[PDB]
Design a protein around this nucleic acid. Sequence first.
RNA 1: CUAAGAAAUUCACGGCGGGCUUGAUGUCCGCGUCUACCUGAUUCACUGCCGUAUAGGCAG
Length: 108
Amino acid sequence: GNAAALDVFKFLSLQYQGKNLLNWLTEDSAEALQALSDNAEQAREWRQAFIGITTVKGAPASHSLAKQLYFPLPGSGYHLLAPLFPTSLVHHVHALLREARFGDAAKA
RNA sequence: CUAAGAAAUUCACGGCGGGCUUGAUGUCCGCGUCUACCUGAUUCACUGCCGUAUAGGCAG
């Protein structure tokens, strides 16, 4: 999304009492859902807003510049298979490779 | 029906100033290389004659 609104991301990914705010706002926790709003309706609308950030926004669409690859079905058929870039996998492999190539134990 | 489908990197350029690498040196003792074979298979498509002949025959 926007590169200037990422402050709410680090505010939402906080670990105040031991774990993330996401699981706190998914469940009906008494500790959460009241520290942010004095009114119940404000708490509800803020909760739906902060939880819908992990859901798909809009209709499912893959652009023309995106890749779509036919895969032949076993019996007389095809599926379209538009793949998305696994940024989580490349981040995890980047962390592993950075540890292997520039880590303290590795360079030792 | 292919991480599908598409694409101009490119213009210009002084690398050179100079220099002692030299001194010395024991390679070395010893040694059983044997045994047994058909080169030759049409392996000399050769020399001469009749005929203008490359066409085609003939002589030892």
